[PDB]
Amino acid sequence: VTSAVGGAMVGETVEGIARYPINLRYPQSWRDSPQALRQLPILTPMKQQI
Amino acid sequence: EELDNTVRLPGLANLWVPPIRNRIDMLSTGIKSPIGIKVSGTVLADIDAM
Ligand SMILES: [Cu+]
């Protein structure tokens, strides 16, 4: 929820003097409605589909 | 003069100064030449070629 449906920063790309953020999140199709979040797939460490 | 004429090794350009003046000049991180042109940029290659 902080990254997939979020978009929290994970790092900065450096280009000479400039620094640009790097994002990380799922597509928008999994962000529209609460019903779309109720079905947000998660891969538990047990390698199962929940 | 005798000091300068005695110490001679390849790869050195001798300077004989007072200790206090030498320390002041070492801590003085400014520009010594009469006129100075500062070219600033975002990367090193452009300002060097400029
Ligand atoms: Cu020095």
Curated annotation (Swiss-Prot), chain B:
Q: Which domain of life does the UniProt lineage start with?
A: Bacteria
Q: Which locations, inside or outside the cell, does it occupy? A: Cell inner membrane
Q: List the induction conditions.
A: Transcriptionally regulated by CusR in response to copper and silver ions.
Q: What result follows from mutating M26I?
A: Loss of copper resistance
Family indicated by similarity: Belongs to the resistance-nodulation-cell division (RND) (TC 2.A.6) family.
Query: What's this chain's function?
Result: Part of a cation efflux system that mediates resistance to copper and silver.
Remarks, anything else?
The cus system plays an important role in copper tolerance under anaerobic growth and, under extreme copper stress, in aerobic growth.
Q: How does it assemble?
A: The cus efflux system is composed of CusA, CusB, CusC and CusF.
The name on file for this protein is Cation efflux system protein CusA
Query: Which gene is annotated as encoding this protein in its UniProt record?
Result: cusA
Q: Which residues of the full protein are shown?
A: 647 to 696 of 1047
